[PDB]
Design a protein around this nucleic acid. Structure first.
Ligand code: NA
Length: 91
DNA sequence: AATAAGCGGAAGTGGG
DNA sequence: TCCCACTTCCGCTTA
């Protein structure tokens, strides 16, 4: 199964949910979710994974926080904003 | 209060 | 056995 960080990077590359997620500074790998439209993106993640329950943005962000220690995605001190690592961006 | 983002410990599920 | 990569649940903090 695709990993969450890859799901998000693929959405940013394809532009399929441009009203739910966007680059802030693509060169730095910073991206931001829509306050009003992030739930639709979370729903898509859960359906892609085949999870038992409906996915919510809260649960998706709970998973995102676990990448902080290994570095694939870090939280930025701006609303709904995160940053991919250079390794993730280069792969 | 109502609303929202952010946090993480703990236990459960998947597929190795 | 026991880690992977989350998922689910719950309670708390700050604005
Ligand atoms: Na929120």
């Amino acid at each position: 199964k695709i990993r969450l960080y890859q799901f998000l990077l693929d959405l940013l590359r394809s532009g399929d949910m441009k009203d739910s997620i966007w680059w802030v500074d693509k060169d730095k790998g910073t991206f931001q979710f829509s306050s009003k439209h992030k739930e639709a993106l979370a729903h898509r993640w859960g359906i892609q994974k085949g999870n038992r329950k409906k996915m919510t943005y809260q649960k998706m962000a709970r998973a995102l926080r676990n990448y902080g220690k290994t570095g694939e995605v870090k939280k930025v001190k701006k609303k709904l904003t995160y940053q991919f690592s250079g390794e993730v961006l280069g792969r």
